[PDB]
Amino acid sequence: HHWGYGKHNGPEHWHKDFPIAKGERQSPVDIDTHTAKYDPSLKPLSVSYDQATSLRILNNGHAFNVEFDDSQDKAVLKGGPLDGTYRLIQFHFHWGSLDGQGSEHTVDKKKYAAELHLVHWNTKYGDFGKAVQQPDGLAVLGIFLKVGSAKPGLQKVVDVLDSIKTKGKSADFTNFDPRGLLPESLDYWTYPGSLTTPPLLECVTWIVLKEPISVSSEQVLKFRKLNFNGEGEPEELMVDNWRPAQPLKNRQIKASFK
Numbered sequence: 236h237h238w239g240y241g242k243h244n245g246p247e248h249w250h251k252d253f254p255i256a257k258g259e260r261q262s263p264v265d266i267d268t269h270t271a272k273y274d275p276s277l278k279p280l281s282v283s284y285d286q287a288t289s290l291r292i293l294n295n296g297h298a299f300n301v302e303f304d305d306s307q308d309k310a311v312l313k314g315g316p317l318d319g320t321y322r323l324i325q326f327h328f329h330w331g332s333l334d335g336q337g338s339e340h341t342v343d344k345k346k347y348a349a350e351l352h353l354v355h356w357n358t359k360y361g362d363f364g365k366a367v368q369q370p371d372g373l374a375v376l377g378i379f380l381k382v383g384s385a386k387p388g389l390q391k392v393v394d395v396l397d398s399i400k401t402k403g404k405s406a407d408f409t410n411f412d413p414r415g416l417l418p419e420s421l422d423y424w425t426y427p428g429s430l431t432t433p434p435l436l437e438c439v440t441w442i443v444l445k446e447p448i449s450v451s452s453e454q455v456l457k458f459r460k461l462n463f464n465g466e467g468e469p470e471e472l473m474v475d476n477w478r479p480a481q482p483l484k485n486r487q488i489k490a491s492f493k
């Protein structure tokens with residue numbers, strides 16, 4: 236794998252090694268709020284993170300991931316459009332070089348400063364690897380970030396970034412509560428899509444919250460000081476690690492709210 240976000244290995248190149256990049260249910264997409272329809276068949280959404288067990292934070296050269304113990308039903312997502320139980324495995328963000336860009340999904344073409352992805356796999360498939368071979372294998376909860384007041388529940392993440400500056404670095408990140416990253420409202424849009432990075436697999440039920448969280452300029456500035464490169468290599472700032480909106484094709488976006 237040599238894909239990235241630069242001019243020479245970015246989203247316009249991915250299809251050459253991952254042909255599904257031009258598939259029928261790719262993500263992200265623009266959410267046209269006027270075209271999205273309230274769906275009364277959606278069940279209440281349940282985010283149950285009270286027993287979440289975070290483990291580690293890692294710079295993988297594309298973003299940073301906070302990883303969780305998913306060997307049991309400790310932190311799960313249920314309800315909404317979902318059939319069954321989806322276990323939290325990791326979260327990460329995508330962000331921009333400037334406040335006016337960074338999100339992957341857009342809302343009426345509006346780009347947010349960043350986007351948080353909480354990644355879950357369908358427990359009926361036994362493990363994450365098997366889940367990504369299924370059309371309903373994954374559920375990703377997406378949350379927009381705008382720049383304004385600081386998000387206190389994000390600060391522990393911001394503070395540890397100095398220790399994972401470069402690709403391949405990791406640090407202990409136990410006892411982190413991901414509930415501190417959510418907005419007040421769970422109103423959402425949902426549609427069937429894909430991973431937004433290679434391998435771009437079409438396994439994801441996307442649940443994108445309507446209400447953004449606010450983070451401070453200082454918090455997002457710290458994200459932008461991370462490096463795509465490994466230690467000892469020329470420095471490339473980890474910024475603009477987002478894929479732009481892809482064709483909606485034969486899909487409808489549903490809203491949980493009237």
Ligand SMILES: CCCc1ccc(S(N)(=O)=O)cc1
Nearest residue numbers: 237238243244248249251252
């Ligand atoms: C020297 C690496 C060149 C290169 C390899 C792979 C990709 S892709 N199709 O985005 O995975 C783009 C550029």
Ligand SMILES: CCCc1ccc(S(N)(=O)=O)cc1
Nearest residue numbers: 352354375429430431432434
């Ligand atoms: C091995 C796949 C890892 C992975 C890639 C992309 C995503 S995302 N940006 O949430 O669609 C989640 C997990």
Ligand SMILES: [Zn+2]
Nearest residue numbers: 327329352431
């Ligand atoms: Zn993501």
